[PDB]
């Protein structure tokens, strides 16, 4: 059995479990069950499953070097799939809510969930709530007797909290911190003093890296009962690095990828987002380039968005990117090396994560 | 130490813990810490604390009849307060998100959180996410070594899931089930075939009763290590009953309480809500009264909302209410009686919940 085909089979099994429990215990009717089914499929399916498959891949890694009965291999893979799905659905929660928060139009070349005609924001906000509740329903049902249950549940919450904290950092990133105040409508930054590497890094680490890289790697370790075969500080550091690289690619794509090939129309310029382009561009601009940037950033007006793009194009940020790229290729390989001291297997699983991030 | 003054002290201690952990582990800056502090106070404080205080009251009940060292009494009360706060903050999550979902204007005579000038919906949706994450942060920190930790965590999730399911039932209550479909914009019901006692009951049970009545009673039991001194099926049934009564009062208040004395301007008529008034009114209307109701329900137009009110006024629903009241006074007292077989203390704690619901 190919890993993907296992993963996907477990989706069906998990879906059937959740909906049948809704009928037997939560008094649901068939039409509401269908609604929730369509919501689950529309919001959890259709991506690459990079996060969920990472849990499966790390588990498979350890299977190849650890003695187990066949039924134990099966059990561990079924746990890897279930934990995988917890993370996918946790992402779906965040994608649903974030698309509402930001007033987004599309993702994966289809409309945001809230924009479906029969959904609306009133239902979608609560649909996103349910998606994350399902992660806990999954975990208590399938992992009830597992020795890893508490470590797994405790890890998952802290990543979830961290992500919501990252979300806060992100949607506040175009404000001046010293002006934050619930009483007072928040003006956009005029000095851009807080568009720095360290501030950028903080947004990305909390908003993305913990849920996309750390969570899947460490869940792989928990369901395999293999946490003591890695140095957890290394796992965190390599996760940070790959996570940050991932986002920098995703920031360069918002600006320069055709909207058709991005699965969405990019708005980072017009949302005044603390992207890697703006931070890096402000790291090398002259006075006059900075003044022009400020007059044109965070304006929905397309003439001005052409101006920020022209400034970025003229700025030669590709050279800054290859240099960042090179250093990250450097640093990840050092971390992989350090990871081979304890688990060669694990370090290989990190290498595979790194390749799939480094290409796309 | 009065119970309230204990509860409130623990709020300060919990708040300080959460914000200091944000600084030491989540890299937060002082202005974002202040923002979150103001958000916590504005969204968790200002009510009666009926739910949180119930956990404290049930625990105190058992203290009076169980032998413990003084430090154990203290510990149990501090757990009751912490668990209490988990429920208050879980409510705050739901109130924040629901006010956004429904486009509400006020609660407790102050603006909804999303409407504060420095917040906005983009931040408030994620603020509500954080509120519920804090419940889990609280629980893992304060209850890490507690024998009740897993039962507590497992109960809390299922109530949370149940509530979000109740929310779905509620916002879909004015639709025809057989028409639900994410692809198709949902028309309001024309026949009102689904405004029945049983359908009403389902909305209320999931949306309110589990989080308002069941959760606090059973959390009281868990932190007191007293679950085997009650018959859990009785606890559930008495919770259902009081929960439903609570909502019926809250449905009569939406229509007939001055907006000043409700802490909000009522919209159940105009939202086409499955209230106890509409269900009960449709349980005794003649053909002509039903036709008029249908022409006037779910329309923001005030002339028509005067017409639904005039129909309800003429319908003599007060008589239907005293009869429902009487039966519930009947049935709760039977359940209290059955609850005295095992725990007299517990049954008294349920009696107190019942009095505070039955007055206000
Ligand atoms: C496996 C160990 O991981 C951690 O300790 C991270 C690093 N730290 C933070 O920056 C916020 C709290 N904590 C985390 C808890 C889980 C995700 C965030
Ligand atoms: C203490 C036992 O309580 C239950 O079994 C209820 C009753 N039942 C439902 O209707 C949905 C699932 N389950 C609950 C789980 C917790 C809240 C909802
Ligand atoms: Zn966003
Ligand atoms: Zn992007
Ligand atoms: Zn609502
Ligand atoms: Zn109401």
TrEMBL record, chains A, B:
Annotated positions binding Zn(2+) 4: 102, 170
Binding site for Mg(2+) 2: 102
Positions that bind Mg(2+) 1: 98, 102, 170
Amino-acid positions noted as binding Mg(2+) 4 in the UniProt annotation, renumbered to this chain: 250, 254
GO molecular function terms listed in the Swiss-Prot or TrEMBL record: (2E,6E)-farnesyl diphosphate synthase activity; dimethylallyltranstransferase activity; metal ion binding
Binding site for Zn(2+) 8: 250, 254, 268
Protein residues bound to Zn(2+) 7: 250, 254
Keyword Nucleotide-binding: no
Residues annotated to bind Mn(2+) 2: 102, 170
Binding site for Mn(2+) 4: 250, 254
Domain of life per record: Eukaryota
Binding site for Zn(2+) 2: 98, 102, 170
Sequence positions that bind Zn(2+) 3: 102
Cofactor: Mg(2+)
Binding residues for Mn(2+) 3: 250
Gene Ontology CC terms, in alphabetical order: cytoplasm
Record GO biological process: farnesyl diphosphate biosynthetic process
Binding positions (Zn(2+) 6): 250
Binding site for Zn(2+) 5: 236
Positions bound to Mg(2+) 3: 250
Presence of the UniProt keyword NADP in the record: no
Designated name of the protein: Farnesyl diphosphate synthase
Organism: Trypanosoma cruzi
Whole-protein coverage range: 64 to 423 of 425
């Amino acid at each position: 059995m190919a890993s993907m085909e296992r993963f996907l089979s477990v989706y069906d099994e998990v879906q059937a479990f959740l909906l049948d429990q809704l009928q037997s215990k939560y008094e649901i009717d068939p039409n509401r069950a269908r609604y929730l089914r369509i919501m689950m499929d529309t919001t959890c399916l259709g991506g690459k499953y990079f996060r969920g498959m990472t849990v499966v891949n790390v588990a498979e890694g350890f299977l190849a070097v650890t003695q187990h009965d066949e039924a134990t291999k099966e059990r561990i893979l079924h746990d890897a799939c279930v934990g995988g799905w917890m993370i996918e659905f946790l992402q779906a929660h965040y994608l649903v809510e974030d698309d509402i928060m930001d007033g987004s139009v599309m993702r994966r070349g289809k409309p945001c969930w809230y924009r479906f005609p029969g959904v609306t924001t009133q239902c979608a906000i609560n649909d996103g709530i349910i998606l994350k509740s399902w992660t806990q329903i999954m975990a208590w049902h399938y992992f009830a007797d597992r020795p890893f249950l508490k470590d797994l549940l405790c890890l998952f919450q802290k990543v979830d909290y961290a992500t919501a904290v990252g979300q806060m950092y992100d949607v506040t990133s175009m404000c001046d911190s010293n002006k934050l105040d619930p009483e007072v409508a928040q003006p956009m930054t005029t000095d851009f003093a807080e568009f720095t590497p360290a501030i950028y890094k903080r947004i990305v680490k909390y908003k993305t890296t913990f849920y996309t890289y750390l969570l899947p790697l460490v869940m792989g370790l928990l369901v395999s009962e293999a946490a003591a075969s890695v140095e957890m500080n290394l796992v965190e550091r390599v996760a940070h690095l790959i996570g940050e690289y991932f986002q920098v690619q995703d920031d360069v794509m918002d600006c320069f990828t055709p909207p058709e090939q991005l699965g969405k129309v990019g708005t980072d310029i017009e949302d005044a987002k603390c992207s890697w382009l703006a931070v890096t561009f402000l790291g090398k601009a002259n006075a006059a380039q900075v003044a022009e940037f400020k007059a044109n950033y965070g304006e929905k007006d397309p003439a001005k968005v052409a101006v920020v793009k022209r400034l970025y194009s003229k700025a030669n940020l590709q050279a800054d990117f290859a240099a960042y790229e090179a250093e990250v290729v450097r640093e990840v390989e050092s971390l992989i090396e350090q990871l081979k001291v304890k688990s060669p297997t694990f370090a290989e699983s990190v290498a595979v994560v790194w390749e799939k991030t480094h290409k796309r």
